Amino acid sequence: MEEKVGNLKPNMESVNVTVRVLEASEARQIQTKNGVRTISEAIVGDETGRVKLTLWGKHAGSIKEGQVVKIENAWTTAFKGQVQLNAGSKTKIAEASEDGFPESSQIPENTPTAP
C-alpha cells in the first residue's frame, strides 16, 4: 500500500514510499534470536515527516545522503515509542524523480509515533 511518512503505523506489512535520504550511517552487526545480522540505519523523509529506516541484509550500507529513492514492499515495526521503517530481502529500492522533491530544509522534523 502507498504511504506518506507522517501516516505510518506499527505493523504495516507492505509499504511503498518515496523519500529523500537525510542521513545514512555506517553498517554494523546486531544480535537477533535467529543469529547475527548486518544492518545500517538512515533517516529518510517526505513533505509530511521523517522516519528511521533500518536496512537489513543486501540493503545495509547501500544508500547515501541526498538521494531520492522509491522504496517498494518495506514493512514497519514499533521501537521505543516510534514507528520504524524496514527494508529486507523482498523490499525493492530504486532512484526516483527529484523534479521538485523537497530538500532537507523543507522536510519537517516530526516522526510517526506509536499509540
Side-chain angles (χ1 to χ4, degrees):
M1 43 171 68
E2 300 284 340
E3 298 291 338
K4 296 305 192 174
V5 171
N7 197 61
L8 298 172
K9 299 173 176 67
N11 315 310
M12 293 174 146
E13 301 282 334
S14 182
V15 348
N16 300 349
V17 297
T18 296
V19 291
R20 174 151 334 246
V21 184
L22 297 158
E23 190 257 91
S25 304
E26 290 260 272
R28 64 198 187 83
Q29 301 187 315
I30 62 161
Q31 301 185 260
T32 87
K33 178 64 161 282
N34 302 312
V36 171
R37 304 289 178 263
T38 307
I39 64 163
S40 76
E41 305 277 15
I43 307 185
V44 302
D46 64 22
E47 74 283 355
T48 72
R50 59 185 66 193
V51 68
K52 195 172 248 180
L53 173 61
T54 300
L55 300 110
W56 298 87
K58 74 189 176 180
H59 296 297
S62 67
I63 66 176
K64 293 179 79 105
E65 183 172 337
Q67 293 175 341
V68 182
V69 294
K70 179 69 212 182
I71 305 180
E72 300 176 81
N73 198 39
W75 77 92
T76 64
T77 55
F79 181 64
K80 296 184 171 265
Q82 284 182 309
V83 179
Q84 306 294 311
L85 192 60
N86 296 267
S89 69
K90 307 209 164 62
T91 307
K92 297 177 201 91
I93 302 176
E95 290 340 277
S97 183
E98 182 165 286
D99 288 271
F101 198 93
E103 290 166 56
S104 65
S105 51
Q106 285 65 54
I107 290 167
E109 290 179 346
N110 58 288
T111 55
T113 301

